[PDB]
């Protein structure tokens, strides 16, 4: 199931209008409180006018609206289930603006929701763009509109949440498809559940930022239910998805062909492992006792060139195990892995002990000391996040999490780890005064300006429960060693939530739940627009444009020349992200050293070390003197 975030508005004095309504299925049948009566558009005698079909509500007075629900006809007939849709709000009934929510609802008879940030409105409109099975009709048994108990205007300077993207699945895993710019998402064998899976199938969904279209695809070719997996983008531009509900399987997602390709089985069955792309484009993984068995699962390595997984049994998992009360089932999960110099992989946590992993021969592991500071030794931080915001300087920001996977209080702990050469123990210090809000199951992304956006989570880890939620995101600004609260959202994002950086410099945050008949499934995402995209006006800022790039593909150590429509102060490369269960081993940022050629022509060299400039797809962002970033130019980095 799911739930509204607000309280149902009394509909006593509502006036409603529909684009058309069959006699006996009048527009007002969707507001009579009777689940056995429904509105239905013209059919048979009246013709079958195709969608879009429209439901418009006049609530007579201004309400602090934060959602709607739509109950499909309950008579066992599928005709008129709403697929693609948009929700609009208005204070006048003529000027509707842009949708507050849009997307696609799953094809079934369950209550559907649009949950979105509070906005005072008197009128509400639901546009049914398509029928879920491609038929001409729209039907609705009951429509409700929900209110918050109050409204406060967002604070100037602190970003903005919205719109909502409605989805047919809970996006418990996600990736940017870098060649298309779309957001790829998946759940499990069902849109809302993983329990009871027979394996072999994954429901996926994509959202296209350019069109706003949400589509879906069932993936069976790879014989893989990809819930609870490792995820890495390899050097050959393929998303490598490992294990989970089918513990030994590898699925490959190829962005260029928009297709899934079977990969080699892993040597060890794994679930909840982290995998990390390496300096040579291969993918390393270790741990993962959620599935495939509970035992010591040492490293192994995937080669995109030979299409093999090779065991690295001497890359020992033991030194990175947390002291989780549930034991090995949890203690080898979600390692904070980062590909680094010369085929090495740094493991920054969640265990107190940090480690260097080595991929030559049959593998190795070397202690890198304890994550700590003058505040003391950092405790185990399961589902804490780790973000490499300056790969050139080896800088990793770590934060949050709890000593045990669940039933454990999260902390505000945050550290800066500074990587040097593999085999050396990195310096670690505390980050500012730590997080504003203790959280676990939170998610995070590095932004073009090197700040880290941190969102959602809860104070006490209770998977599938939306309790002790944190609604206020934070941004860490490294130059200031300071965290800043941002404007809060209204949708709980805890266990099974994701965040990814979008090519437009905004953040896509969604998911949470995946517990079947629970009411805590969130079939949606929201956009966060950082303050750097706004003028002091409160209007969206004018963005610099990248008018030319010398190339779209570059070797590490190589140069790129660009032209812009205005003078550029700073530039960065951000590697495209993948996300599930708090883990994102693909994102990282390289600040670029610009040569000014004059006439708004600029050059830069990609770092020569592929342990820094990890091969794969990257976003190029340029920022004007006002600190406003361009939209991303896509750059493939090769060896
Ligand atoms: Ca009804």
Dump the DSSP string for 141-187. Answer: SEEEEEE-S---PPPTTS-EEEEEEE-SS--SEEEEETTTTEEEEE-
List the structure tokens of 312: 């690295």
Residues 575/616, Cβ–Cβ less than 8 Å = yes
- Rounded distance from Cα 462 to ligand 1 centre (Å): 37
Question: DSSP code of 94?
Answer: S
Residues 6+ apart with CB under 8 A from 148: 5, 6, 64, 65, 66, 118, 490
Measured distance CA(430)–CA(373) in Å, rounded? 6
The torsion angle over the Cα atoms of residues 77, 82, 83 and 89, rounded to 10 degrees, is -170
User: Is 581 among the annotated ligand-binding positions?
Assistant: yes
Residues shown for the chain: 639
> Nearest-CA neighbor of 526 among 477, 551, 489?
489
Q: Which listed residue (405, 495, 532, 602) is catalytic?
A: 495
- Rounded distance from Cα 191 to ligand 1 centre (Å): 26
Measured distance CA(470)–CA(448) in Å, rounded? 24
Measured distance CA(146)–CA(227) in Å, rounded? 32
Q: How many CA atoms within 13 Å lie on the side-chain side of 238?
A: 23
Report how far Cα 467 is from the mean position of its chain's Cα atoms.
21
Measured distance CA(136)–CA(108) in Å, rounded? 17
Question: Is residue 55 annotated as part of the catalytic site, yes or no?
Answer: no
User: Is 272 among the annotated ligand-binding positions?
Assistant: yes
Measured distance CA(372)–CA(415) in Å, rounded? 8
- Rounded distance from Cα 29 to ligand 1 centre (Å): 5
- Rounded distance from Cα 72 to ligand 1 centre (Å): 9
Parallel/antiparallel/unpaired status of strands 160-166 and 101-104:
parallel
The sign of the CA dihedral 590, 339, 175, 524 is negative
Measured distance CA(317)–CA(632) in Å, rounded? 37
Pinpoint the alpha helices (H) of 352-496: none
User: Is 189 among the annotated ligand-binding positions?
Assistant: no
- Beta partners for residue 525, in sequence order: 165, 510
This PDB structure is determined at a resolution in Å of 1.8
Measured distance CA(609)–CA(613) in Å, rounded? 6
Residues 499/455, Cβ–Cβ less than 8 Å = yes
* Terminal C-alpha separation, the chain: 47
- Sketch out the chain's domains with CATH numbers: 1-153 (2.60.120.260), 154-541 (2.130.10.80), 542-639 (2.60.40.10)
Residues 163/102, Cβ–Cβ less than 8 Å = yes
Q: Is 89 helix (H, G, I), strand (E, B) or coil?
A: strand
- Rounded distance from Cα 629 to ligand 1 centre (Å): 49
- Rounded distance from Cα 518 to ligand 1 centre (Å): 25
> Nearest-CA neighbor of 445 among 404, 488, 497, 495?
497
The experimental method, as deposited, was: X-ray
Neighbours of ion ligand 1 (CB under 5 A): 29, 32, 34, 37, 141-142
Measured distance CA(638)–CA(553) in Å, rounded? 7
Residue pointed to by tokens 């992993």: 357
Residues 575/556, Cβ–Cβ less than 8 Å = no
Q: Which helix (H) or strand (E) holds 308?
A: strand 308-312
User: 273-300 in b/e burial notation, b at 16+ Cβ within 10 A?
Assistant: bbbbbbbbbbbbbbbbbbbbeeeebbbb
- Edge-first strand listing for the sheet containing 238-242: 230-233, 238-242, 250-254, 259-262
List the structure tokens of 103: 């997307």
Residue pointed to by tokens 């209110």: 147
List the structure tokens of 499: 């965040």
């Amino acid at each position: 199931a799911s739930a509204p975030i607000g309280s149902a508005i009394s509909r006593n004095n509502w006036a409603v209008t529909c684009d058309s309504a069959q006699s006996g299925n009048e527009c007002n049948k969707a507001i009579d409180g009777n689940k056995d009566t429904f509105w239905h558009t013209f059919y048979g005698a009246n013709g079958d006018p195709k969608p879009p079909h429209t439901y418009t509500i006049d609530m007579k007075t201004t309400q602090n609206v934060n959602g709607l629900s739509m109950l499909p006809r309950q008579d066992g007939n599928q005709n008129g289930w709403i697929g693609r849709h948009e929700v609009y709000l208005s204070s006048d009934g003529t000027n509707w603006g842009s949708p507050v929510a849009s997307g696609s609802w799953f094809a079934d008879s369950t209550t559907k929701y649009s949950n979105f940030e509070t906005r005072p409105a008197r009128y509400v409109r639901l546009v049914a763009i398509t029928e879920a099975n491609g038929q001409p009709w729209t039907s609705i048994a009951e429509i409700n509109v929900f209110q918050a108990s109050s409204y406060t205007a967002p604070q100037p300077g602190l970003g903005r949440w919205g719109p909502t993207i409605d989805l047919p699945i809970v996006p418990a895993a996600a990736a940017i498809e870098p060649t298309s710019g779309r957001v790829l998402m998946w759940s499990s064998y069902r849109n809302d559940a993983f329990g009871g899976s027979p394996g072999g199938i994954t429901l996926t969904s994509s959202w296209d930022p350019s069109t706003g279209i949400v589509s879906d695809r069932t993936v069976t070719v790879t014989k893989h239910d990809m819930f609870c997996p490792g995820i890495s983008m390899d050097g050959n531009g393929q998303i490598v998805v490992t294990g989970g509900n089918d513990a030994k399987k590898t699925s490959l997602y190829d962005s260029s062909s928009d297709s899934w390709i079977p990969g080699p089985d892993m040597q060890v069955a794994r679930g909840y492992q982290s995998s990390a792309t390496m300096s040579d484009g291969r993918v390393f993984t270790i741990g993962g006792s959620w599935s495939g068995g509970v035992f010591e699962k040492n490293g192994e390595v995937y080669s995109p060139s030979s299409k093999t997984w090779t065991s690295l049994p001497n890359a020992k998992v033991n030194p990175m195990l947390t002291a989780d009360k549930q034991g090995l089932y949890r203690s080898d999960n979600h390692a904070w892995l980062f590909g680094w110099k010369k085929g090495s992989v740094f493991q920054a946590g969640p265990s107190t002990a940090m480690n260097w992993y080595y991929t030559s021969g049959s593998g190795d592991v070397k202690s890198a000391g304890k994550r700590q500071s003058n505040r003391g030794v950092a405790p185990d931080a399961m589902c804490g996040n780790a973000v490499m915001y300056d790969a050139v300087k080896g800088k990793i920001l770590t934060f949050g999490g709890s000593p045990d996977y669940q039933d454990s209080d999260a902390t505000t702990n945050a550290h800066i780890i500074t990587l040097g050469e593999p085999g050396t123990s990195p310096n670690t210090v505390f980050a500012s005064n730590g997080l504003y809000f203790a959280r676990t199951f939170h998610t995070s992304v590095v932004l073009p300006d090197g700040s880290t956006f941190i969102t959602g989570g809860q104070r006490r880890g209770i998977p599938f429960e939306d309790s002790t939620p944190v609604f206020t995101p934070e941004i860490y600004v490294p130059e200031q060693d300071t965290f800043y609260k941002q404007n809060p959202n209204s949708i709980v994002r805890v266990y099974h939530s994701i965040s990814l950086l979008l090519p437009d410099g905004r953040v896509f945050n969604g998911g949470g739940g995946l517990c079947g008949d629970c009411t805590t499934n969130h079939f949606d995402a929201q956009i966060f627009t950082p303050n750097y995209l706004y003028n002091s006006n409160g209007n969206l800022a004018t963005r610099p444009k990248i008018t030319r790039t010398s190339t779209q593909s570059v070797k590490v150590g190589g140069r790129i020349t660009i032209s812009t429509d205005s003078s550029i102060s700073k530039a960065s490369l951000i590697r495209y992200g993948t996300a599930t269960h708090t883990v994102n081993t693909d994102q990282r940022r390289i600040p670029l050293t610009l040569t000014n050629n004059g006439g708004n022509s600029y050059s830069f060299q990609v770092p020569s070390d592929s342990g820094v400039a990890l091969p794969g797809y990257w976003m190029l962002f340029v920022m004007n003197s006002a600190g406003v970033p361009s939209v991303a130019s896509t750059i493939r980095v090769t060896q």
